[PDB]
Design an enzyme around this catalytic site. Sequence first.
Site, mmCIF file in Angstrom:
data_model
loop_
_atom_site.group_PDB
_atom_site.id
_atom_site.type_symbol
_atom_site.label_atom_id
_atom_site.label_comp_id
_atom_site.label_asym_id
_atom_site.label_seq_id
_atom_site.Cartn_x
_atom_site.Cartn_y
_atom_site.Cartn_z
ATOM 1 N N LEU A 49 0.796 -1.219 0.000
ATOM 2 C CA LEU A 49 0.000 0.000 0.000
ATOM 3 C C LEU A 49 0.832 1.275 0.000
ATOM 4 O O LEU A 49 0.442 2.250 -0.655
ATOM 5 N N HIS A 50 1.973 1.287 0.696
ATOM 6 C CA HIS A 50 2.762 2.509 0.835
ATOM 7 C C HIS A 50 3.470 2.890 -0.461
ATOM 8 O O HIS A 50 3.485 4.068 -0.837
ATOM 9 N N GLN A 51 4.072 1.916 -1.146
ATOM 10 C CA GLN A 51 4.708 2.159 -2.434
ATOM 11 C C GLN A 51 3.714 2.536 -3.521
ATOM 12 O O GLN A 51 4.047 3.350 -4.387
ATOM 13 N N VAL B 29 3.108 5.979 -2.789
ATOM 14 C CA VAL B 29 4.320 6.794 -2.832
ATOM 15 C C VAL B 29 4.890 6.812 -4.246
ATOM 16 O O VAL B 29 4.975 7.872 -4.877
#
Length: 189
Positions: free
Chosen positions: A30-32, A35
């Site tokens: 989820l973060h990548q 991002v």
Amino acid sequence: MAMDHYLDIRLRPDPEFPPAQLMSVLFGKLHQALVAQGGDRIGVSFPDLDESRSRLGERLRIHASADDLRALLARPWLEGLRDHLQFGEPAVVPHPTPYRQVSRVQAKSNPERLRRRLMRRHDLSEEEARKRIPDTVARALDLPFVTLRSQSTGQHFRLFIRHGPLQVTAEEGGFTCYGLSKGGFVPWF
RNA sequence: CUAAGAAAUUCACGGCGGGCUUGAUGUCCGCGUCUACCUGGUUCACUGCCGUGUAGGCAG
């Protein structure tokens, strides 16, 4: 509360992973995408948790729109959890809606963080370092999350996070990269 | 109201000397232990990260 992007979804059962065993994969996938893919008109909320029960994930609760979060129904970046999860699409929100308080912040509980700071800032070592350093002020933020094992070890580290109040007024705009409210009233439907 | 009612045993000391227990021997014989499986205990309720002061981008 001007946006109307509520996309609900459920869970799926699998035997090869506990709640952390897919929660760390969610923190990896989820973060990548938030991002390296990104999108300020896309995020998440946390309106279905509890303090003592430690409810970290119990349903689909996202914050998107017609174009920014409109790629959340034809995305092959979240492909692989077809043995453990699923997703949905946004629906028409009504006029009076709520807004919950959340935060994807970093809590610190270092009682020897003064010693590791003074090793490059003070020279006060661990021999005489017990005079006025914070011995118990670095408390822990106990809460239910996934066990992301970085290069420090393979054990499951606790996911600290602070909840928030409930206000009738809203605040549209942008939040932090994790979706927690760093100034913006997060969504809680 | 009790075969009731009462009471100072004191003191001293050489056990001592000697010695061949000997000789002999077959413990033999046998055996199927057998199957079964998911630790990322959190090898610290957080290590190590800009201010030693309570807000934070990280190997999550």
